[PDB]
RNA sequence: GUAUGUCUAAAUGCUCUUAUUUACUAACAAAAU
């Protein structure tokens, strides 16, 4: 499990994880991909922390964009992944609650 | 009237005045009594407790001995000591501002060291360098639990929360900033508002999401940087003024 | 060939403190105290170090 | 060695004897964070709260103030004020910074002002100068509301916006109402015209935003 | 106490009416050790503090029945010395004149104390209450750290 | 590169740190001397 | 606490079987771990040109890849991988592929090998 | 001076109870003061060790130093004998432990560790109140 | 105004000298009068 | 000797597969009869 990586996806890892979202509500939502479809969150927190992790992801997104390399075509695709980004966002500002 | 309205006070009794921490991490590391291994939790927390001051408020073991220092528990409302705590609990009247003022220069009105720098978020018990009895009120969104409400509505919650905790100089509640400017007469009252009203709801039991109120995060009350446009520097400016001139009375 | 000046053991010195004080105590309540207070040092030191793991 | 604690009259009490004790590098002073010795003293026996030095003396010295009080040690003002004082007839900039706080404490300058304060010659001569130069019911038209308040108990919830200038006291008695109309700036009841106008214009401002 | 391990032999005589007592004693002082999550340095203290009156009252219990009373034989109080249910230096202290009552014995350790003195316990109500009045302010101290003990003096 | 030569050395006086040194341990407390 | 460590320290209730299950439970949401393109540290065999900005990037030169299965295996039973590398100057995702029939590499859209 | 004040053992205990779930801004110096303590856990140790009860006695009490705090428990005394009596002690032990073993068919050794490594050692407490310590190692004398 | 000075006895366990936390520390060399520095008075093989 | 750095506003249970590993790390060391 050399890189880091491994080590924090080793089981014992995982089964501490578990049991701390078990016992006082430790999760890591930097830790889970976010779900695609919305309206499977019953809960509120929830739904804010998955929220503040896409603006999360955003930021990140903008921040490398404006790099010096202006004409590489990865920017260009990241242009794309910040318009769904946005969306994203958008959408977890449903109008539930 | 705190004294002849009652001794007794016992706020929030030894059963249950508090846990300990609030799960962050995985682990929980005894030197500093914080979570570690993870760090995923906005962690301001809603007060569970208030100082409902009219009721509270009374003579302690403090009162009798002559203790200058107000009771920062008994501010957050949750003295369990009560009759016996050795700190007064009372809102900052008048004399005992007077008696204390000596001393408030280095220390809150708590008997606690003010810093040299201010905290780089205006967070906590305010610098001895600049004196100050203006409070940033702040997260007034979530201190409410997201309630559609009016500013107007806020400003009045405001004031009543306010008023009460000390004589109020003026207060702002503003729109484009989403915050509640307030400044006090005396400095010690102003500290022992904002110790009060830290991680406080601005909700009321008539509010529809009153059983709810712990579930969001409370008042984010800080002291407040220095207002820019012009007026309100020139007011302050006129105050420097009249306080230089009473100093140099006194003096003469 | 031991010390010609020390007297001060490291016991007396403390005693002659205000926060040692002195107590009669059965030896296997003795030796499980050591146990629990070795215990509490050696696990607030590793937290202070920050390896809370 | 070690230079004296510089403590005030009216820091350390009335008292012809008292005792402290001294805590050689006890805590960080709180402008320099620099270890010095604390001095803590009780005032009287019985009296309760210590007083413990919250500068280290070198900082005292340069701002020429009391260890425990942070005021002048001649004329027991903030140090701020007093400056001021004397700019007004140059204040201190004191770094707010991890390193060069320390620096600016180690540099025996005596920062600014101080010199004029310790000396006879100097704060006498500024005082001398000083002297010189000295020688229901809505409510309409800034000054406090613990003014106001003050106010309509001399007379006898109070809220005053400032950008309105528009006072509304609630008393929530008929009797405390009725007492204070006959007892005694405009005030109804739940140059008039120009005060007129400059309300309007106030009320407008209010509600722009 | 100490536990029994045929060491001394079981108890003199009149133990049986007396143990009764003091096994109360024991009870109480069951329910001071241990946890009580005090939350607070205060209320931390107050346990520490009960503990110790608790303490005192056995030993006072002990030392009024052998001396004062006399109800009880030398050998029994002996034997009683020799267990850990009595306190030998507080006795001692109590039967000396002018520290008859006594809250603990480090209530009167000089060498302790920041100013060389002992507890303020010591000093009758009376004297402090005078010097109050003298002053302006009210009754002053109300308990020492050591131990509870509200006018712990002789008088 | 940074793997570089140098131009001078250092001496500056901080607070001292109060470690208990292995070689600063005491040893031959007493100091000999000459015959006059 | 050192890297020759014999035993991890386990809960009192650690049912292994258990865990592991949870963890399995626990790694369909999992961020890392359901990925593909696992990092690596390789150098390169082929010594080749990076195709964008033309860096000569020469044999044996270490760097932090992506290694990534192939699900078109070789053959049967011999899997084969992409091996994405980032040319020095420009960055540009150079790889490569190991088919195993000539005990050597292939080129895959990245740069040419000389 | 005054000699120090003997303590009631009730009060220590109470004191090792407190600071077993110590996590508060409440004793923030207890902690400090027991790292500061870890200088002197050797020398607990050697002292405790050295108070060792001999075969021939039940349970041993001992004289206590404590830190107020309750951060370091030393065993003061220093264990003295008469020289020829304590000779004479082990010899007999040595004689009692040599008759066990022409007795006992298996002679069943302790396991080590005697507590598990999950299992928190019990307080002192829980076997104050237990029965009367079983018999030590004395042999049958004339 | 006479005052008593004293040392109190801290507990042997807590760090004795609490300030120091090996602290850097910048000087400023202070030199307000001026050193005279004095002195007196083929450059291609050089 | 398992490098590193920046970046952070305050669906539920279910079972079935194994005589393995898309395993990762190379700082460590390098010869014949
Ligand atoms: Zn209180
Ligand atoms: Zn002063
Ligand atoms: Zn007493
Ligand atoms: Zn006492
Ligand atoms: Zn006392």
């Known amino acids: 499990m050399s890189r880091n990586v491994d080590k924090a996806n080793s089981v014992l890892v995982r089964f501490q994880e578990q049991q701390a979202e078990s016992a006082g509500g430790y999760k890591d939502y930097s830790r889970y991909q976010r779900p695609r479809n919305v309206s499977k969150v019953k809960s509120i927190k929830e739904a804010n922390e998955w929220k503040r992790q896409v603006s999360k992801e955003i930021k990140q997104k903008s921040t490398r964009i404006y790099d010096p390399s202006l004409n590489e075509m990865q920017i260009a695709e990241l242009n794309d992944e910040l318009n769904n980004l946005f969306k994203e966002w958008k959408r977890w500002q449903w109008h539930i609650d | 009237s705190w004294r002849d309205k009652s001794a007794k006070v016992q706020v929030k009794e030894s059963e249950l005045p508090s846990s300990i921490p609030a799960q962050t991490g995985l682990t929980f590391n005894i030197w500093y009594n914080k979570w570690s291994q993870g760090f995923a939790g906005n962690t301001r927390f809603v007060s569970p407790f208030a100082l409902q001051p009219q009721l509270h408020s009374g003579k302690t073991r403090g009162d009798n001995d002559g203790q200058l220092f107000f009771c920062l528990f008994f501010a957050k409302g949750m003295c369990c000591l009560g009759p016996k705590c050795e700190y007064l609990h009372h809102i900052p009247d008048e004399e005992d501002i007077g008696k204390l003022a000596l001393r408030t220069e280095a220390l809150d009105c708590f008997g606690r060291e003010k810093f040299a720098d201010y905290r780089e978020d205006m967070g906590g018990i305010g610098s001895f360098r600049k004196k100050n009895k203006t409070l940033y009120v702040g997260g007034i969104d979530g201190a409410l639990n997201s309630k559609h409400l009016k500013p107007a509505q806020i400003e009045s919650r405001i004031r009543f929360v306010f008023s009460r905790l000390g004589d109020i100089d003026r207060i702002r509640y503003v729109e484009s900033k989403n915050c509640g400017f307030v400044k006090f007469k005396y400095q010690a009252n102003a500290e022992f508002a904002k110790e009060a009203m830290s991680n406080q709801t601005l909700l009321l039991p008539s509010d529809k999401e009153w059983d709810d109120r712990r579930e969001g995060t409370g008042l984010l009350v800080k002291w407040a940087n220095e207002d820019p446009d012009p007026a309100a520097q020139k007011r302050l400016q006129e105050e420097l003024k009249l306080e230089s001139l009473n100093m140099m009375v006194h003096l003469i | 060939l031991p010390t010609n000046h020390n007297k001060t053991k490291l016991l007396k010195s403390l005693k002659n403190t205000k926060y040692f004080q002195q107590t009669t105590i059965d030896w296997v309540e003795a030796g499980l105290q050591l146990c629990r207070q070795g215990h509490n040092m050696l696990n607030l030191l590793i937290h202070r170090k920050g390896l809370t793991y | 060695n070690e230079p004296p604690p510089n403590i005030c009259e009216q820091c350390l009490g009335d008292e012809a004897n008292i005792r402290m004790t001294k805590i050689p590098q006890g805590s960080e002073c709180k402008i320099c964070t620099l270890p010095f010795t604390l001095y803590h003293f009780k005032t009287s026996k019985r009296s309760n709260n210590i007083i413990k030095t919250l500068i280290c003396v070198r900082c005292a010295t340069q701002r020429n103030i009391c260890q425990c009080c942070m005021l002048d040690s001649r004329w027991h003002i903030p140090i701020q004020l007093r400056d001021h004082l004397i700019s007004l007839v140059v204040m201190t900039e004191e770094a707010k910074n991890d390193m060069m706080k320390r620096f600016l404490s180690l540099k025996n300058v005596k920062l600014g002002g101080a010199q004029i304060t310790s000396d006879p010659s100097e704060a006498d001569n500024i005082v001398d100068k000083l002297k010189n130069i000295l020688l229901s019911f809505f409510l309409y038209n800034s000054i406090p509301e613990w003014k106001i308040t003050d106010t309509v108990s001399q007379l006898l919830s109070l809220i005053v916006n400032h950008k309105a200038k528009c006072g509304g006291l609630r008393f929530q008695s008929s009797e405390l109402g009725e007492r204070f109309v006959s007892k005694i700036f405009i005030i109804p009841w739940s140059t008039a015209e120009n005060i007129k106008l400059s309300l309007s214009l106030n009320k407008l401002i209010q509600l722009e935003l | 106490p100490r536990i029994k391990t045929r060491r001394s032999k079981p108890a003199p005589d009149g133990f049986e009416k007396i143990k009764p007592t003091l096994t109360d004693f024991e009870i109480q002082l069951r329910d001071a050790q241990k946890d009580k999550s005090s939350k607070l340095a205060a209320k931390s203290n107050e346990q520490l503090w009960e503990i110790m009156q608790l303490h005192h009252q056995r030993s006072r219990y002990i030392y009024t029945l052998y001396y004062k009373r006399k109800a009880i034989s030398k050998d029994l109080y002996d034997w009683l010395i020799k267990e850990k249910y009595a306190d030998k230096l507080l006795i001692a202290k109590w039967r000396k004149t002018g520290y008859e009552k006594l809250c603990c014995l480090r209530c009167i350790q000089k060498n302790e104390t920041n100013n060389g003195s002992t507890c303020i316990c010591r000093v009758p109500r009376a004297q402090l209450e005078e010097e109050a009045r003298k002053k302006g302010t009210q009754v002053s101290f109300h308990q020492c750290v050591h131990c509870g003990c509200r006018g712990c003096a002789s008088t | 590169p940074q793997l570089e030569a140098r131009s001078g050395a250092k001496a500056a006086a901080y607070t001292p740190t109060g470690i208990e040194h292995a070689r600063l341990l005491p040893g031959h407390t007493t100091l000999k001397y000459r015959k006059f | ?114 | 001076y005054t000699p120090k004040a003997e303590m009631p053992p009730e009060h220590l205990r109470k004191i090792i109870n407190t600071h077993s779930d110590m996590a508060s801004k409440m004793y923030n110096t207890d902690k400090k003061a027991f790292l500061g303590a870890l200088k002197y856990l050797p020398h607990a140790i050697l002292k405790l060790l050295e108070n060792m009860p001999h075969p021939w006695e039940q349970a041993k009490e001992v004289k206590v130093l404590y830190h107020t705090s309750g951060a370091i428990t030393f065993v003061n005394e220093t264990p003295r004998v008469i020289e020829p009596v304590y000779t004479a002690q082990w010899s007999a032990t040595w004689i009692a432990m040599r008759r066990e073993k022409r007795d006992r068919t298996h002679f069943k050794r302790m396991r080590f560790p005697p507590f598990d490594d999950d299992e928190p050692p019990l307080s002192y407490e829980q076997h104050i109140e237990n029965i009367e310590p079983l018999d030590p190692i004395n042999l049958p004398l004339d | 105004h006479h005052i008593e000075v004293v040392s109190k006895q801290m507990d042997p366990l807590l760090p004795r000298f609490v300030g120091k936390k090996a602290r850097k520390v910048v000087a400023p060399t202070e030199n307000d009068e001026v050193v005279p520095v004095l002195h007196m008075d083929d450059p291609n093989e050089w």
């Open chain 7, 1 to 114: 606490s050192e890297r020759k460590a014999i035993n991890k320290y386990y809960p009192p209730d650690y049912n292994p079987l258990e865990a592991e299950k949870l963890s399995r439970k626990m790694a369909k949401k999992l961020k890392t771990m359901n990925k593909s393109h696992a990092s690596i540290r390789l150098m390169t065999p082929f010594s080749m040109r990076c195709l964008e900005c033309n860096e000569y990037i020469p044999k044996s030169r270490k760097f932090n890849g992506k290694k990534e299965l192939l699900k078109e295996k070789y053959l049967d039973s011999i899997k084969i991988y992409r091996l994405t590398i980032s040319c020095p100057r420009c960055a540009n995702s150079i790889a490569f592929r190991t088919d195993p029939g000539n005990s050597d590499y292939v080129m895959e859209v990245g740069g040419v090998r000389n």
